[PDB]
Amino acid sequence: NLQTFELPTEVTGCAADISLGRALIQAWQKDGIFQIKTDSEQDRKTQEAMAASKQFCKEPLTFKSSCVSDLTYSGYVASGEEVTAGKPDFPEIFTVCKDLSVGDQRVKAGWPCHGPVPWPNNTYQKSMKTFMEELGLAGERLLKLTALGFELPINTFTDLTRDGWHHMRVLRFPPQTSTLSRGIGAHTDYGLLVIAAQDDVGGLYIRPPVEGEKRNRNWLPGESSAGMFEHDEPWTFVTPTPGVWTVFPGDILQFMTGGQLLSTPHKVKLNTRERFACAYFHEPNFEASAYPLFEPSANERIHYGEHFTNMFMRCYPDRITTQRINKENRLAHLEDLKKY
Numbered sequence: 001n002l003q004t005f006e007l008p009t010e011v012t013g014c015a016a017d018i019s020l021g022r023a024l025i026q027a028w029q030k031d032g033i034f035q036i037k038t039d040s041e042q043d044r045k046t047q048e049a050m051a052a053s054k055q056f057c058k059e060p061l062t063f064k065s066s067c068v069s070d071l072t073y074s075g076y077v078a079s080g081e082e083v084t085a086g087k088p089d090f091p092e093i094f095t096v097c098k099d100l101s102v103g104d105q106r107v108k109a110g111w112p113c114h115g116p117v118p119w120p121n122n123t124y125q126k127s128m129k130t131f132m133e134e135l136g137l138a139g140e141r142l143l144k145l146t147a148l149g150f151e152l153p154i155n156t157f158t159d160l161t162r163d164g165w166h167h168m169r170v171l172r173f174p175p176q177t178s179t180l181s182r183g184i185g186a187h188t189d190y191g192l193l194v195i196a197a198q199d200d201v202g203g204l205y206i207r208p209p210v211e212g213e214k215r216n217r218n219w220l221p222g223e224s225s226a227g228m229f230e231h232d233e234p235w236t237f238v239t240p241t242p243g244v245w246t247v248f249p250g251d252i253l254q255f256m257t258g259g260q261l262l263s264t265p266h267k268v269k270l271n272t273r274e275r276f277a278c279a280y281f282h283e284p285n286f287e288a289s290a291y292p293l294f295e296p297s298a299n300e301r302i303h304y305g306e307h308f309t310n311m312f313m314r315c316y317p318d319r320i321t322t323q324r325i326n327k328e329n330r331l332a333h334l335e336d337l338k339k340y
């Protein structure tokens with residue numbers, strides 16, 4: 001059974017705040033996951049986002065496929081389009097990244113992944129943007145409490161999430177209709193926090209920390225966490241529970257804390273019913289460089305925007321976003337943006 005916490009509206013660093021940060025870290029180090037209780041507005045905006053999702057998914061595939069961009073990875077993923085560990089995942093997804101128009105200087109400069117969300121409609125954009133502003137507030141709470149539990153300056157993590165690369169995967173998993181029950185393969189997500197909401201059907205499994213088990217550093221090439229431990233136990237079932245979001249660490253948190261926190265492996269199993277979920281990613285700024293918090297002398301850095309772009313090219317190798325990245329070689333502009 002998971003732990004559920006209520007976050008304070010504002011995190012000031014008082015002793016109850018430091019206590020709470022201590023407990024979240026502990027929960028992460030034991031269960032690899034915990035729940036935060038939602039208030040009425042957070043819940044209402046979660047239900048609106050789900051309702052918008054189901055509506056969008058009823059639309060014919062040609063319409064849904066039309067919501068795609070060669071500037072940004074925001075938009076539609078068909079069931080079967082995403083690749084995990086060499087195998088296609090089967091949900092339909094609408095990814096929402098930072099919604100930047102063609103009038104933004106980063107977009108003008110051809111920065112990779114920077115571009116406008118191909119929204120199906122304005123009502124869907126309102127619901128999604130209202131949901132993510134609430135998720136973002138919760139992520140900043142969480143990041144301040146985490147740094148407090150680690151006896152770090154309160155702003156240690158929030159300093160990297162100014163204009164952060166926050167994004168969300170709006171997922172619809174189909175019922176299991178074939179021999180394959182694999183919804184999404186065992187993977188780790190790429191930022192600091194993942195905050196997820198869930199319908200009543202159920203199907204997400206997460207892997208807790210295991211003593212002495214090696215966890216791949218998904219930010220290195222040749223240490224991809226994609227597919228690791230998929231058919232080895234233990235795997236906790238995240239029971240659908242009304243009035244909560246779940247939170248677990250992403251790749252940046254694992255790197256920065258030198259493994260005190262682990263980027264939680266998770267997978268999804270197709271159920272007898274279609275299953276709706278939203279996964280929110282509280283990320284650093286695109287130009288932020290993560291650093292090891294407990295090894296000052298260590299030179300390792302993770303330029304977060306390079307990690308995001310790498311990740312999203314390996315998910316979507318044939319998507320028009322990726323083609324244009326290859327065509328104009330915007331990975332080179334990424335190295336330029338590091339220096340000029």
Ligand SMILES: NC(=[NH2+])NCCC[C@H](N)C(=O)O
Pocket residue numbers: 082083084085169184187188189226311312314315
């Ligand atoms: N864009 C994502 N969050 N994808 C999550 C699934 C894992 C992804 N297919 C990978 O290979 O890393």
Ligand SMILES: [Mn+2]
Pocket residue numbers: 187188189266279
């Ligand atoms: Mn995930």
